[PDB]
Ligand binder design. Structure first.
Ligand code: HEM
Length: 452
């Protein structure tokens, strides 16, 4: 009762690779897996991957006795600029689990009691910039969501003030990060990599890894002249971290610790303007809960419905959209698809969150009240933060940051979807709505003990 594995139209020496000559590869890999089922094979020269989309199979892949963690084929390149160091190392690494058990305890729920104040500091900045737009003026959502999420990691994680809001044009580091990823992403759709046709391109990329390093120089310099870098320097295990691997860990968290989080907020706010009854309902929760000008740690933990709106928007659109895995031994999967040792499966997350056998037929509706009883979401049907001993380390940081902010936004403004924005999701590894803009009617509620 073995079953042959599916596969998209191959085109020659290229195999299936030319089905990814598009700038929305994930979005297209869910049209493929949309037809070819819960699993389908994917060959591009000298690399093969299986794509699992059903909870039925994901729940096996996450069985850590069968499967270990893997580097996306995107990850080995984003390793040409990150780890050895957490988000781009294999479990079989030394400056992984040492590099993780220095930081893990700094990222718990309890550790957020400490970051909370600086998180509220950057949040106030974003709210007030909106209080001070002219009439005609609209909001660039993903654009301002980045201003925040980045400032906030820089500041909680590295006690450095990036002052992203004191700048009309996206911070250098972000313009360069974006252009560094689009490369990694196209250098993946490139049929002949080592070519001179791509030559102005791997020198561009280097200029960009310099701008990004600039800001990293600036953050260490500022420290010399209990943050997340106070350990990344003086945290033992039993080895503190070394010369070279620390400027890695830094660029690693400046990226991981904001991008995916900016994604989640643009998406949530999108979904809310399109479902104005959910906006209304979280807008009340926020009014009812945040009764001081600024929120307390205590208060942010009681934005229950807002936590829910975040998870729902994370179901419908995981911003870190896929994670990889390898087989630890030869094995059946599903009892049908037989894998060798080392074979690679990719967890197409946005599709797993659309598995109707686990969710309903309304998998495409925005309904935050699914997450009322979170004991109702089945084993493994939901994983925006990866799975297992390599779950997203910064999940509790992300969710607190994101609730706090979505919570304040909804306390001080009504938003109008003024352009009838039709969704367009730019892909730079991670997903984020592109050119999403709205207007905000302020509720004229004072903040900080400051009027406007
Ligand atoms: C906001 C602060 C965040 C930080 C500092 C952060 C950092 C990290 C780190 C260090 C890892 C690797 C952990 C490990 O290997 O032990 C990771 C993995 C991951 N993160 Fe995050 N992250 C953040 C937010 C988010 C958000 C909002 C999402 C939403 C989808 C997300 C999605 C993921 C996913 C899917 C992985 C899986 C990697 C894999 O297992 O292959 N992250 N993150």
């Amino acid at each position: 009762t073995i079953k042959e594995m599916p596969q998209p139209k191959t085109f020659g020496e290229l195999k299936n690779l030319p089905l990814l000559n598009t700038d929305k590869p994930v979005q297209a890999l869910m049209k493929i897996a949309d037809e070819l089922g819960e699993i389908f094979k994917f060959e591009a020269p000298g690399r093969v991957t299986r794509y699992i989309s059903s909870q039925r199979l994901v729940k096996e892949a996450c069985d850590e006795s069968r499967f270990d963690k893997n580097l996306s084929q995107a990850r080995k390149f984003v390793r040409d600029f990150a780890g050895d160091g957490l988000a781009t190392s294999w479990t079989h690494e030394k400056n992984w689990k040492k590099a993780r058990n220095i930081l893990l305890p700094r990222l718990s729920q309890q550790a957020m009691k400490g970051y909370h104040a600086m998180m509220v500091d950057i949040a106030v900045q974003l709210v007030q910039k909106w209080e001070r737009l002219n009439s005609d003026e609209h909001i660039e959502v993903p654009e301002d969501m980045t201003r925040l999420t980045l400032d906030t990691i820089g500041l909680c994680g590295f006690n450095y003030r990036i002052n992203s809001f004191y700048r009309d044009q996206p911070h250098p580091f972000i313009t360069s990060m974006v252009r560094a990823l689009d490369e990694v992403m196209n250098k993946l759709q490139r049929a002949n990599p080592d070519d001179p046709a791509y030559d102005e391109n791997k020198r561009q990329f280097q200029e960009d890894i310099k701008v990004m390093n600039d800001l990293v120089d600036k953050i260490i310099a500022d420290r010399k002249a209990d943050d997340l870098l106070t350990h990344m320097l003086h945290g033992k295990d039993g080895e503190p971290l070394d010369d070279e691997n620390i400027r890695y860990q830094i660029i690693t968290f400046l990226i991981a610790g904001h991008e995916t989080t900016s994604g989640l907020l643009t998406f949530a706010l999108y979904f809310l303007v399109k479902n104005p009854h959910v906006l209304q309902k979280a807008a009340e929760e926020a009014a009812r809960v945040l009764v001081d000008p600024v929120p307390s740690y205590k208060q942010v933990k009681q934005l229950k419905y807002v936590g829910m709106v975040l998870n729902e928007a994370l179901r419908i659109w995981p911003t870190a959209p896929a994670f990889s895995l390898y087989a630890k031994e030869d094995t059946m999967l599903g009892g049908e698809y037989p894998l060798e040792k080392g074979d690679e499966l990719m967890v197409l997350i946005p599709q797993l969150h659309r598995d109707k056998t686990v969710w309903g037929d309304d998998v495409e509706e925005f309904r935050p009240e699914r997450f009322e009883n979170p004991s109702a979401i089945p084993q493994h049907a939901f994983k925006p933060f990866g799975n297992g001993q390599r779950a997203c380390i910064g999940q509790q940081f992300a969710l607190h940051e994101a609730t706090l902010v979505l919570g304040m936004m909804l306390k001080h403004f009504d938003f109008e979807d003024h352009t009838n924005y039709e969704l367009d999701i730019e892909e730079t590894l991670t997903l984020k709505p592109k050119g999403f803009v709205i207007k905000a009617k302020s509720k004229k509620i004072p903040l900080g003990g400051i009027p406007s």
